[PDB]
Amino acid sequence: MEHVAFGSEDIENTLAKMDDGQLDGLAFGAIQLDGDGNILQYNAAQGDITGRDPKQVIGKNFFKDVAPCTDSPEFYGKFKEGVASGNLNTMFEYTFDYQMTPTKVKVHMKKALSGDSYWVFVKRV
Numbered sequence: 001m002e003h004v005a006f007g008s009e010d011i012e013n014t015l016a017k018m019d020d021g022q023l024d025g026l027a028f029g030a031i032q033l034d035g036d037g038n039i040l041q042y043n044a045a046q047g048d049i050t051g052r053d054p055k056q057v058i059g060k061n062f063f064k065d066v067a068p069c070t071d072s073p074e075f076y077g078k079f080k081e082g083v084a085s086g087n088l089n090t091m092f093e094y095t096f097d098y099q100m101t102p103t104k105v106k107v108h109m110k111k112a113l114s115g116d117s118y119w120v121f122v123k124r125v
């Protein structure tokens with residue numbers, strides 16, 4: 001397993017060295033999006049939670065297609081502001097409930113080290 005704690009201050013630095021293979025070792029969900037909400041990476045842990053297939057969601061809009069239950073001021077609203085500002089680091093509780101059992105999780109959004117990429121870290125609570 002890759003030893004990285006959810007909410008770690010330097011998490012964007014640590015994860016810059018990973019690949020899809022290495023990301024699959026994390027204890028929590030991790031989604032990498034571009035400036036437009038498109039999925040660039042999708043680890044095995046978020047798949048265990050949402051039931052999605054990582055390899056099948058890659059390339060689709062996170063907010064439009066895959067997870068419309070996030071299209072909201074509380075989530076998407078926060079993402080867009082972050083993207084436009086060029087900085088993003090917020091943590092909140094959300095309920096995943098689209099075509100799945102209503103699941104309470106902890107969501108950590110943070111801008112990555114790379115120019116135009118954003119992290120979505122998730123964990124059951």
Ligand SMILES: *C(=O)/C=C\c1ccc(O)cc1
Binds near residue numbers: 050052066067095
């Ligand atoms: C609501 O849709 C919230 C979360 C979520 C995340 C990923 C996937 O694939 C579905 C739903």
